[PDB]
Each structure stands twice: as structure tokens, then as C-alpha cells.
């Protein structure tokens, strides 16, 4: 059979946080240098930030996907993103 695998190992589909650790860390140190030069980033408490940012993003894509299906279209234009930004309140 070719379905039961997709039934017994697909009882648990989760998906994960993805933004790469080293590039993200380099980026945040880069935008932290100008705010305060020689800012030593503690290697802890950065996973919590790197989960919170992704959470807010996936909220933004779910809102823009709702807006997209509201426009009978699957692709994303800048209009959806900017109105999501404005209507959320920032």
C-alpha cells in the first residue's frame, strides 16, 4: 500500500521554526552595534526572541492569507501587507 504510511506517520505533522541561527544572530548583532557599540550578546535568551519574532511573522502571513482569499487570489501583493500593518495598529 501507498497510503497507510501517510496515515500512521502523518498522525503527527508539526512544522518548525526555521530562520537560521547564525545569520539571524549576525543580523541582530549588526543592528545592535549602532544602538550600542561593543554590545556583548548573551548566548541565552536569544531563542525566546527568535521564537517571538517568528510568531509575529506567521501571524502576519496568516492575516495576509486571509486578505488574499478575500481577494479570490492566492499570491501576495504589497497591498495586503501594508493594510495588515495599518489595520493591526502599527
Amino acid at each position: 500500500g501507498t497510503v497507510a504510511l501517510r496515515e500512521i506517520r502523518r498522525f503527527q505533522k508539526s512544522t518548525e521554526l526555521l530562520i537560521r541561527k547564525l545569520p539571524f544572530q549576525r543580523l541582530v548583532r549588526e543592528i545592535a552595534q549602532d544602538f550600542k557599540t561593543d554590545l556583548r550578546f548573551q548566548s541565552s535568551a536569544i531563542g525566546a526572541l527568535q521564537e517571538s519574532v517568528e510568531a509575529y511573522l506567521v501571524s502576519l502571513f496568516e492575516d495576509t492569507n486571509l486578505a488574499a482569499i478575500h481577494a479570490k487570489r492566492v499570491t501576495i501583493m504589497p497591498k495586503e501587507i501594508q493594510l495588515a500593518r495599518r489595520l493591526r495598529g502599527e
Binding site: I19, P23, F24, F61, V74, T75, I76
Partner: peptide, 28 residues
């Protein structure tokens, strides 16, 4: 000058996380 570090496939799988396989050319 490393803002471009976040790669395009990272954005594509970020969109894949939220559903809909449709992705534009400047959504990244």
C-alpha cells in the same frame, strides 16, 4: 550590511509554514 543574510528559500518555507504555496517576487 548583512540584512540580505536571510535567504529566499527561508522566506519560501516561512510562507509554506502559514499555508498557501503562492509566493510573489518581492514578498521576500
Amino acid at each position: 550590511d548583512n540584512i540580505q543574510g536571510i535567504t529566499k528559500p527561508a522566506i519560501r518555507r516561512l510562507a509554506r509554514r502559514g499555508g498557501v504555496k503562492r509566493i510573489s517576487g518581492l514578498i521576500y
